[PDB]
Symmetry: C3
Amino acid sequence: MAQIWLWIGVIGMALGSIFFGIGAHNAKNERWKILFTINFFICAIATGLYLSMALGQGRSVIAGRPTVWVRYITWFLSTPLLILDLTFLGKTSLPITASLLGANAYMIATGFVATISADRTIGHIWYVVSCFAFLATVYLLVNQYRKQAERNYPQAKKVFRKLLSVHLVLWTLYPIVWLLGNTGFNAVNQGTETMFYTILDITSKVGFGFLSLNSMHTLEKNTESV
Amino acid sequence: MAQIWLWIGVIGMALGSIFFGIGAHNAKNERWKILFTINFFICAIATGLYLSMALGQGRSVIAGRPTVWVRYITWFLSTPLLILDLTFLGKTSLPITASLLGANAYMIATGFVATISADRTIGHIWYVVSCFAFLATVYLLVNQYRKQAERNYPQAKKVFRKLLSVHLVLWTLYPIVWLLGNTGFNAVNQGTETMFYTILDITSKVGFGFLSLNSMHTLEKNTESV
Amino acid sequence: MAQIWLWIGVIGMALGSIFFGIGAHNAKNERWKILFTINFFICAIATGLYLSMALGQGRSVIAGRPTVWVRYITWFLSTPLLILDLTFLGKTSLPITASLLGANAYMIATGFVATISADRTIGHIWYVVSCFAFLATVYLLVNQYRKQAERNYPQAKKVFRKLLSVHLVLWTLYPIVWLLGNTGFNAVNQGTETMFYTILDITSKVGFGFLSLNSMHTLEKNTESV
Ligand SMILES: CCCCCCCC/C=C\CCCCCCCC(=O)O
Ligand SMILES: CCCCCCCC/C=C\CCCCCCCC(=O)O
Ligand SMILES: CCCCCCCC/C=C\CCCCCCCC(=O)O
């Protein structure tokens, strides 16, 4: 089960890569080229790292617990690009952008330590720290980021509502899966944990990628010159 | 002794984080927001990494020598932000900024190798290389950086004198502690080495943070419009 | 043989560092300062990492195969700076610059995995992936990069022809050496593999550095105001 869902990961991310790549190549102006290029690299990075997992790499048995540590290398590289999707579309100020990228990096880094810690009590301390880093990003997104975006696009409030709704719901699912998996309560087997992360990853990357494109189109039409 | 001084580290950096965070949240313009945000992240990074050390992590016994390698992860991330404090306040040109960040990264990277090298002769070669990287930064700071800062703020020469004096004195203490510790002559026990680094870290982060804020206020008042 | 050619590496990169450093110090304007500083850091990074290799570091025996993994740390840091040489001189757009840096990072990262993989079949999968990342960069360079450069300097088409010719020929030699070495067919001994990489590295860093300087002079004279 694990094996097939890793390969579905490779196929999904590779298909996302190709179509974002073709978009980037054909891009009508620099704004569209940039957005297509961010999403291409999110999906390209995820493809290669899913290939490593499918080939049996990036995994260690830590005190008897099978642990896919390469997964956090993927997240550390792809999640800031997903935040750049948001800050690009929102035309976010540098301090709030920096704060979002900082908190997110902190979330993933503490997430990594929470995972690879042999002492699972220490791991679970880091989980809580990581959740607080996520909460920091949630606060920044629904406050400073949203208000800046709404100020920049007064007629497109709903666009950023949809973007933030999808981001916040999908990203909250990750720490829930982490709790269900061998990292936490171990309520689901490795096959199921792998399926959950793969579906999450394809949705949060290819799914959110296409939503980011659709959102750019709506903003472009909404701000079209008379 | 080691244990308590690691926890004093956590408390100090966490208190620095909170007050810089509150400053950032309340920041009167983008210049103040940026400065508060840089210092928040210096102290936030240091908090989490001091928590890892206090919890017993980030440490290895290398050929019988207890070695806290995570300490250099902290320095590699926080020291460029401290340099950004200087280059932000000094409105430093991109090449000199880049040169400062480059030399500093080189210092910490060679510092790391100097530490984790099992062969202590090779370690001590890397110490000397790291000292020369520091000397490079000293030269850049007291020459190009200072002259640019003085050119930018002709009436605030003393501000940058105070900033550079505190930076140069505090940062020179680090390689001295390194020589006194198990990395060098082992003239002080692990408890004392830990106390020294903690006091240095709180001073160079929270201390220098507040000096950076005070300096910004002086520059803002000095350049206030008639 | 290996040992001497590592030390020739240290001497070559150190000599390149000094002369680029002296250029940077004496630089006539910010454009020359930036170009000199990029090339200084390419050569400075390479010096320190060649010193580590010469001192016997950064090497592991992976399932009986001696493997110099620190070599890919050098390439991961120095190769984007070499790309920055090109994008600086070409005044390349941000998306194409980003695409070049992204593909190059991907090439070196997959190159690294291709090397350290104990399973050499998996290694050779990663080699092919890495070659496709290189091909991506080749496409970007000879298309978008070249056309932007030619648009920016209509009278200096030959300058960028020379830059791209040297880049493409030299960089293609790396995957050939990789195939000849213990990573591939093992058709050459470790002494010869080391000599090849050292000569390549000095040429692609000091050699290309001086070509980048010469190219800047030609562009400056070609665009000199009447
Ligand atoms: C802006 C970038 C954010 C940086 C994250 C800072 C948070 C620090 C978190 C933990 C660092 C400790 C990691 C080293 C110990 C884990 C290894 C182990 O236990 O084997
Ligand atoms: C601009 C970034 C600066 C990069 C720093 C370059 C200096 C290179 C220093 C040393 C690299 C060697 C590290 C690998 C060997 C150490 C590991 C070991 O001995 O076990
Ligand atoms: C823009 C940055 C590019 C990032 C590169 C992405 C490609 C991913 C490649 C492979 C990741 C797998 C590495 C971990 C497994 C190797 C370690 C081992 O086998 O012992």
